[PDB]
DNA sequence: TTGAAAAGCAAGCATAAAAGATCTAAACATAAAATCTGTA
DNA sequence: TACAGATTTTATGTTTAGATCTTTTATGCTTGCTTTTC
């Protein structure tokens, strides 16, 4: 009609479609319309740029992430409006409404209608832009607030000279579909694909790049460089190329993670450089070979006491193994009256049972095992080399479930002495490991058995 | 054209709505009245509408996905298939991935075996991407009370480790059979 | 000042006392004649009507078109002599008499179902009993009427009463402590009956029984000279709610209000036309106006043999009365509108209604409209339905997963590739007839006809996240539907 | 060898227990209209 | 000897602590058979 289309770089089809739909005039115009695209798609971007090229219209931006309700919600709705109305037009006289009286949908609409009835003045009827950017982002969302938000449209005035238009730009498909009945206008974002990331990141996170404060010190410490800028370009161009095409697998088609990844090895490899191979990109790529393997995206393991050392271990093997077999693997003491050990295990199982969620267990059993597996203690007749079960054993055992190490029947205000409590373990096999190697205890032993 | 679109949505949406909404941009796109001559004889854009609008549906995803991805979602979907319930978690995925690469390997450029740390955000990636869900998590509740009354309870599946979390498969294998391109050479593990 | 935690900005409290009555004539020996004063009783007040009256009026009247028709329904409306209920209103009146004379208090209970006529006749025996206190024989009274689902707050009775005796606006607990004292320690000499209709009884007694505890024992009293009349539903509703013991000390009269037959139905209807049946009309050929005794003579009938069978088909149901009159005017407006349009009228022989209009006024009200809503539905929601049915006729669970649904779609599409229908509907069904789009998963317009059943209240569906083992169900039982599908061809067919 | 005994395995089954949906009441908190209390 | 002051009465909103019921999976008894000790 009488818009101006912006040029965007892979969003030809969605750029037409905002053209097509949004304008200055509300006889033409749609009162709802949706955006939907996943995370880094180019929406926003999008849409600023639509609205920075053509200033006529007329806009409203927030976003429903900050706010974590719809009572906020309304409020903000309601004080951006005033906001936005009276720096727009400042001729015309205009009292004020405070926007914590609004609590409730119904108190919005009465609010809204007061303040739209003072600018009946104007000459020809208009339409304000409310771009709710981010509806899908609220904390606590339900199926309910959207149905709201869609008819309130309706209740409004219908001859008034300002008319409020809604834009929404929501992240999820199965959120979408559940008001799939109400044929609303749609345009979608669809992903990227590796040639368009590219050159987008090259774009983007290319002219930035050179002014930084490294490379110029590595240039200042060498000798010149002709061609400055041409190669510095090149240079910067090479190494998007190499870090997209090392880490592409790992990052998917995700802006934000090589965008970071890019920042992460920047500092040492414009150190690697030199001028021997400034102009010679594949000598200076095998020179800083290291930086293009490992990712490297990451920050005794523990410093618990000897008991409770042997305590999470022992609570391992209480978890991870069946009690029926106990007695083949612990009796190590001879006998006065007549009898017989357990037969054991005839055949191994072949699920390697560490690959499960943890069982339950007693802790009569834990502290039999415990004392089972603890180190021997350092005129035998008042000996007692067993350790035994003092008061020191229990609060290193209580420093243990209050560390989120031992879980039991999760319920509000457990009581530790009660039959009906039992208890589970809480670690992943990488950390029981290393407390075991860190200690001398050989724990695979007990496990290799059933499966390696 | 126009008539056999209009036949097509009578046997499949019947609703005028829905047309009125093709139709908009399409004379709202043209600039000259011969393009919007040639626009209605040959309604080429309402093709090109209808693909979009199925551009991010179940299938409209699973075609922008990377070589790593697409192993990872075969191997779950293997897993969760032999299962008596369906359900699964990390670690039989990742033993499946390995033992697949292993014979690709074997079989036979020799492909990449990435390690547990980098196989971590890819599975967060696919789980943000709606292709695993919880075991039985329910999804959003119908009004602001029920939502209000769960958001003060912790569920279980919040304290479990990582490693141990049970999910949910949303695509079947024989979905993927269908779907992935016999060229690619992930297609021969895609059936027991 | 001080900062909120959380702010309350539009707070509205109304202007009412906290004082009780027994703190006002300090003495009991100082209370004066309440009959005699201005703001008591409602000596003088009768204004209330003209503060808010006066605002829905206009000037205008264009000769509105009166046809013959529309005096038939305007005398056959639930508010324009009983014929049927004597019994009750002997018992109630005799009741309420014997009570006003001998200046006591006494407690009416009356249970019945919707349309009976309860609150009428009721009404009715106020109004005679007004009419006999103002022919000088009883000693005057009041009437104060309280309705149960006219009010915001069930505990909102109190204070009406106070207001409606006292003049005072107070809250409900202070009105509570007034009327047990007026009822209670106010000398007889001082006061007047009172005879309170407490209605709806049910909607007041949903928290607790103390409203209906307060009112009937306010009866036990010797000093008190009320006479309370409640009406309900239920006719065991206090036994169910106060206890045995304490209503069988209250001692209150109890009365039932059967449904109505097929005969009375019908003598309340033929009562209510009598003057108009079998009349003479002129009617004005050119506009249409009718006035009761160029132009032209013509007479109304209305046929004995429709209200027959409008009063028996009404009766064997529920036995109302507002439904039976409701479809007389519906048959009385269909007639009406036949005319109308056959003559070419407009808003501003012998004419009859046949047993025609009766009927078809009647069948609007029994029959179903999802048959023809089935019948009329696109082809993919049909073809759901007949793959929900086939999986119904397999497990027999009457639950069935999603999953299986569309596995059960695409068998069912993929076997009978053979008829021609389903041969070339297959690519606007998978690819919507387009050579770029690839090979979709589930079907063009899944969700769509998803939510069209769901919304209109055919299916359930429970609430999970995963979109591949959620359980749907059938809410029309199963003989509907398979009507619906047998009434198609093409899935007929196949 | 020697089978009698204990130990081990498996199928069919009942029944306790975990995980979460749906709800109630106490503790913590704000506010307008009516009463109470020193002194002009 | 009031009246500006402080205190009480009637009326709802905001967050935490605990209880009861329903659906689905795990735990233990029984019955029949057989390897392992000794
Ligand atoms: N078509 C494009 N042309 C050029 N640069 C682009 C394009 N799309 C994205 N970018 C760049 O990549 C960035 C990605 O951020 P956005 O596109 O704003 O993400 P987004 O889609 O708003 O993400 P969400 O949905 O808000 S998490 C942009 O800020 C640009 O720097
Ligand atoms: N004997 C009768 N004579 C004439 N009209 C009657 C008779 N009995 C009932 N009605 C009609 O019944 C209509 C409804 O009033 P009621 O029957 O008194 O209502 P109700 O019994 O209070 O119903 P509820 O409130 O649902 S229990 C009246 O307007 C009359 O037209
Ligand atoms: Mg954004
Ligand atoms: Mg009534």
Not at chain 1, 134 to 141: C, K, P, T, V
Not at chain 1, 309 to 319: D, E, G, P, Q
Not at chain 2, 98 to 111: G, Q, V, Y
């Amino acid at each position: 009609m009488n818009v101006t289309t912006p040029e965007v770089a892979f969003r030809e089809y969605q750029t037409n479609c905002l053209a097509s739909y949004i304008s200055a005039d509300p006889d033409i115009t749609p009162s709802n319309l949706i955006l939907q695209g996943y995370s880094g798609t180019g929406k926003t971007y999008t849409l600023k740029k639509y609205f920075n090229a053509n200033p006529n219209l007329h806009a409203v931006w927030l976003e429903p992430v900050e706010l974590v309700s719809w009572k906020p919600l309304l409020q903000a709705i309601a004080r951006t409006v005033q906001y936005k109305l009276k720096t727009l037009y400042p001729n015309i006289p205009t009292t004020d409404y405070d926007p914590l009286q609004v609590e409730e949908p119904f108190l919005l609409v009465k609010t809204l209608h007061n303040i739209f009835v003072q600018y009946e003045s104007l000459q020809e009827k208009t339409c304000l832009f409310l771009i709710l950017d981010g509806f899908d982002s609220l904390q606590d969302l339900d199926a309910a607030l959207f149905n709201k938000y869609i008819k309130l449209n309706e209740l409004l005035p219908k001859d008034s000279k300002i008319n409020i238009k809604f834009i929404y730009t929501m992240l999820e498909t199965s959120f979408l579909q559940r008001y799939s009945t109400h044929c609303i206008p749609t345009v979608m974002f669809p992903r990227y694909n590796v040639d368009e990331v590219s050159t987008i990141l090259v774009m983007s996170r290319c002219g930035e790049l050179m002014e930084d404060s490294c490379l110029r010190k590595r240039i200042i410490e060498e000798q010149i460089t002709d061609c400055t800028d041409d190669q510095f370009q090149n240079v910067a161009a090479n190494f998007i190329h190499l870090i997209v095409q090392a880490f592409h697998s790992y990052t998917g088609n995700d802006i934000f993670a090589l965008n970071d990844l890019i920042d992460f090895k920047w500092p040492k490899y414009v150190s690697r450089i030199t001028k021997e191979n400034i102009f010679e990109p594949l000598a200076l790529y095998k020179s800083a070979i290291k930086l293009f393997l490992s990712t490297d995206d990451n920050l005794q393991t523990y410093d618990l006491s000897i008991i409770s050392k042997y305590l999470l271990i022992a609570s391992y093997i209480c978890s991870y193994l069946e009690p029926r077999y106990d007695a083949s693997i612990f009796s190590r003491k001879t006998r006065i009256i007549q009898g017989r050990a357990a037969y054991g295990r005839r055949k191994k199982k072949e699920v390697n049972p560490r690959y499960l969620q943890p069982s339950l267990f007693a802790i009569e059993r834990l502290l039999a095992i415990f004392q089972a597996i603890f180190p021997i203690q350092g005129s035998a007749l008042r000996e007692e080399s067993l350790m035994k079960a003092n008061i020191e054993v229990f609060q290193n055992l209580s420093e243990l479930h209050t560390l989120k190490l031992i879980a039991t029947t999760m319920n509000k205000n457990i009581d530790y002495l009660s039959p009906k409590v039992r208890w589970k373990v809480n670690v992943p096999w990488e950390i029981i490991k290393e407390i075991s190697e860190s200690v001398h205890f050989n724990i695979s032993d007990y496990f290799s058995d059933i499966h390696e | 054209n126009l008539n056999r679109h209009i036949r097509m949505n009578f046997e499949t949406f019947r609703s005028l709505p829905t047309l009125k909404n093709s139709i908009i941009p399409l004379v709202a796109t043209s600039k000259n009245f011969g393009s919007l001559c040639t626009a209605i004889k040959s309604c080429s854009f309402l093709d090109i509408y209808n693909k979009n609008q199925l551009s991010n549906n179940l299938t409209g995803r699973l075609q922008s996905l990377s070589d790593l991805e697409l192993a990872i979602l075969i191997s779950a979907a293997r897993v969760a298939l032999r299962a008596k319930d369906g359900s699964f978690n990390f670690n039989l995925a990742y033993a499946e991935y390995e033992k697949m690469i292993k014979a690709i390997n074997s079989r036979i450029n020799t492909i990449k075996l990435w390690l547990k740390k980098d196989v971590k955000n890819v599975w967060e990636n696919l789980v943000q991407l709606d292709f695993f869900t919880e075991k039985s998590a329910v999804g959003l509740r119908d009004n602001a009370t029920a939502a209000f009354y769960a958001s003060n309870y912790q569920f279980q599946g919040t304290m479990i480790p990582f490693d141990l979390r049970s999910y949910q498969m949303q695509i079947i294998l024989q979905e993927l059979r269908r779907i992935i391109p016999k060229s690619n050479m992930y297609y021969s593990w895609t059936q027991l | 000042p001080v900062i909120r935690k959380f702010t309350k900005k539009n707070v509205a409290r109304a202007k009412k006392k906290y004082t009780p009555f027994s703190k006002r004539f300090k003495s009991i020996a100082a209370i004066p004649d309440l009959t005699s004063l201005p703001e008591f009783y409602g000596n003088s007040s009768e204004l209330m009507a003209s503060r808010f009256e006066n605002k829905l009026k206009t000037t205008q009247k264009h000769q509105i078109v009166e046809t013959i028709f529309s005096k038939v329904k305007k005398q056959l409306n639930s508010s324009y002599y009983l014929p049927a209920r004597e019994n009750e209103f002997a018992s109630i009146y005799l009741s309420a008499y014997s009570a006003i004379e001998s200046d006591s208090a006494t407690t009416i209970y009356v249970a019945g179902t919707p349309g009976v006529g309860k609150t009428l006749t009721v009404r009715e025996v106020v109004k005679e009993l007004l009419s006999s206190s103002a022919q000088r024989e009883i000693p005057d009274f009041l009437y104060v009427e309280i309705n149960g689902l006219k009010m915001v707050k069930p505990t909102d009775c109190y204070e009406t009463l106070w207001n409606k005796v006292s003049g005072e606006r107070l809250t409900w607990a202070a009105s509570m402590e007034s009327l047990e004292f007026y009822f209670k320690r106010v000398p007889k000499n001082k006061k007047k009956t009172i005879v309170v209709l407490l209605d709806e009884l049910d909607a007041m007694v949903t928290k607790s029984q103390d409203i209906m505890y307060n009112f009937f024992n306010w009866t036990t009293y010797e000093n008190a000279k009320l006479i309370v009349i409640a009406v309900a539903n239920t006719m065991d509703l206090p036994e169910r709610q106060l206890g045995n013991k304490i209503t069988s000390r209250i001692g209150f009269t109890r009365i039932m209000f059967t449904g109505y037959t097929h005969e009375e139905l019908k003598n309340i209807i033929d009562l209510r036309l009598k003057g108009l049946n079998d009349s003479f009309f002129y009617v004005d050929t050119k506009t249409g106006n009718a006035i009761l005794i160029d132009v032209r003579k013509v007479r109304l009938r209305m046929s004995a043999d429709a209200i027959e069978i409008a009063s028996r088909k009404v009766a064997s149901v529920s036995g109302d009365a507002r439904r039976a009159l409701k479809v007389c005017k519906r048959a009385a407006e269909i007639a009406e509108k036949h005319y109308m349009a056959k003559h070419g009228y407009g808003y501003d022989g012998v004419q009859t209604v046949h047993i025609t209009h009766v009927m078809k006024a009647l069948n609007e009200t029994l029959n179903s409209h999802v048959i023809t809503f089935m019948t009329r539905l696109s082809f993919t929601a049909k073809l759901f339905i007949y793959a929900l049915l086939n999986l119904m006729k397999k497990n027999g669970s009457q639950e069935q997963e999603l999953g299986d649904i569309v596995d059960e779609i695409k068998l069912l599409i993929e076997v009978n590739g053979s008829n021609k229908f389903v041969m070339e509907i297959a690519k606007t069904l998978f690819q919507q007839g387009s050579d770029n789009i690839s090979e979709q998963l589930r079907i063009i317009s899944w969700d769509f006809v998803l939510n069209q059943l769901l919304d209109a209240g055919i299916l359930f569906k429970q609430t999970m996240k995963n979109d591949r083992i959620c359980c749907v169900k059938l809410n029309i039982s199963v003989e509907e539907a398979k009507r619906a599908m047998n009434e198609d061809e093409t899935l007929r067919n196949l």
